[PDB]
Design a protein around this ligand. Structure first.
Ligand SMILES: [Zn+2]
Ligand SMILES: [Zn+2]
Ligand SMILES: [Zn+2]
Ligand SMILES: [Zn+2]
Lengths: 74, 82
DNA sequence: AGAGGTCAAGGCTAGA
DNA sequence: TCTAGCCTTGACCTCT
């Protein structure tokens, strides 16, 4: 019963290097494959939870990379 | 093809085959708890260029054809599978 | 397992 | 106001 290193949601195994949920797995895949560049509309310190992760793409991706998700896979 | 207005369907939405218009209309009608009223004989015809002439008959047609109110999520989370 | 793919949920905001 | 075309998302799915 392990948790996503990004948002704390239930994790389903390792994805792109680190334990994570299906949401952050899918989010990271789409951000890298499509070369998306996000920007925080606030203070670059947005909360990452199941209910609030979708409210800032920039901080979500930043967390993904900081926690160790490997872009090289794609 | 949309079961409500005949417009081209984009897939299943809230239970039945429907277009993006009726998809969004049903979502807005349920989430905002809208009550509409018909200004005629509660029998307005539903087509692409006419569905927007009576919100009451459009919503009644949505429910008749099987659009499910329970398909709007209380937690408001997107994606996944039902 | 852990990649990539599926496709109906909800989100955004032009255009009427 | 409201509409709907298009985008973003994620629990399952197939594939390597
Ligand atoms: Zn996560
Ligand atoms: Zn942020
Ligand atoms: Zn329709
Ligand atoms: Zn009517």
């Amino acid at each position: 019963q392990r948790t996503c290193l990004i948002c704390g949601d239930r994790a389903t195994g390792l994805h792109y290097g680190i334990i994570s949920c299906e949401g952050c797995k899918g989010f990271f895949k789409r951000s890298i494959s499509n070369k998306r560049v996000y920007r925080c509309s606030r203070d670059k310190n947005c909360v990452m939870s199941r209910k609030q992760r979708n409210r800032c793409q920039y901080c979500r991706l930043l967390k993904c990379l900081q926690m160790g998700m490997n872009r090289k896979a794609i």
